[PDB]
Design a protein around this nucleic acid. Sequence first.
DNA 1: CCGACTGCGCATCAGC
DNA 2: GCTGATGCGC
DNA 3: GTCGG
Length: 326
Amino acid sequence: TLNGGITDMLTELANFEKNVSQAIHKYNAYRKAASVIAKYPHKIKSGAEAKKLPGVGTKIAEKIDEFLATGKLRKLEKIRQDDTSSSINFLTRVSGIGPSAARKFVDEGIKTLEDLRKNEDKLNHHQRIGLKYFGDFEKRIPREEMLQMQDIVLNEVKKVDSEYIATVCGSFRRGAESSGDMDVLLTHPSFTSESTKQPKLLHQVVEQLQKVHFITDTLSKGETKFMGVCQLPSKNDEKEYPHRRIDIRLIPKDQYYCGVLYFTGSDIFNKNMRAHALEKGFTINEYTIRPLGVTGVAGEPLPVDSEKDIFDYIQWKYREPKDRSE
DNA sequence: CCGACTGCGCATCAGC
DNA sequence: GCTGATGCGC
DNA sequence: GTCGG
Ligand SMILES: Nc1ncnc2c1ncn2[C@H]1C[C@H](O)[C@@H](COP(=O)(O)OP(=O)(O)CP(=O)(O)O)O1
Ligand SMILES: [Mg+2]
Ligand code: NA
Ligand code: NA
Ligand code: NA
């Protein structure tokens, strides 16, 4: 694709800033620049040309000039050579290990995949499962497997109660040919912004999926959010499917459209859209869109009857899920 | 120049 | 136990 | 690291 070279460079820089420097703004600055260049329908021929795009300022422009001229970036080359940065970067690849825990571990001389396995008593539960499935979680999910997964989740949900609606979101809903994980939006008429007239609404669904050996592990769980591990059943003599990440979000039914907009993403699209909302004087989360008052406080939830209504409020033309892959 | 940068659930820890 | 802050991941 | 005001 693209300016793949340049966007990979920026991504690597973002990851460095987040994992090593713990500089979260530089990290989102890089991700924004990577995103806007990924979308740019021209092979970038100079940093000057790139600087025209929003989110590419002077520093990134100079970096792009270097990369175009030499095929690489000295800054990254040093970072790759530095033992400590490389170690921290690697450890953050385990789910549940972030920049802080990674640096904690490196400080203790825990630097490798083997070190982690040898020190499992030093891991919290999430981290333990992330280590367990380190390999599998590196693998993307072909859309073909995503479709099989959807059929299982939806049918099992129906069996618990026919009034549940489960909607697969994330990259899948945007039409991707492969997904990093499975994002499931859940609603039930007993759970609204006005009342929860049934307890355990999410629990029952997770229970069912455990019962049929679809959900294999739990990373975290509460009343509206489940995050864990699942696996497709395999056939006689067939190798097993990799284990896969799964998140289920229970959203009040009268807030479906905000919820499905959030969970459909992408993450950077959501950020771009929420930023723009602020510029139009609204705030958007996965529940509501509310006006901001002069005082700087969110007012009362606006009526929403579609995804498009949310776009309409902030004066954006509607964009289909497939065109939100920023 | 420089304040502002999207928003939030769950796990964990600190302090009481 | 609680509250509030931080870590981590969507 | 970038940028609107
Ligand atoms: N930081 C964030 N801020 C706002 N919204 C966010 C954020 N992270 C996430 N989201 C929303 C959008 C995303 O599609 C959805 C699922 O989160 P995921 O992290 O699964 O994103 P994906 O778009 O599913 C790519 P994949 O194929 O690698 O899985 O959750
Ligand atoms: Mg996903
Ligand atoms: Na720019
Ligand atoms: Na991680
Ligand atoms: Na997910």
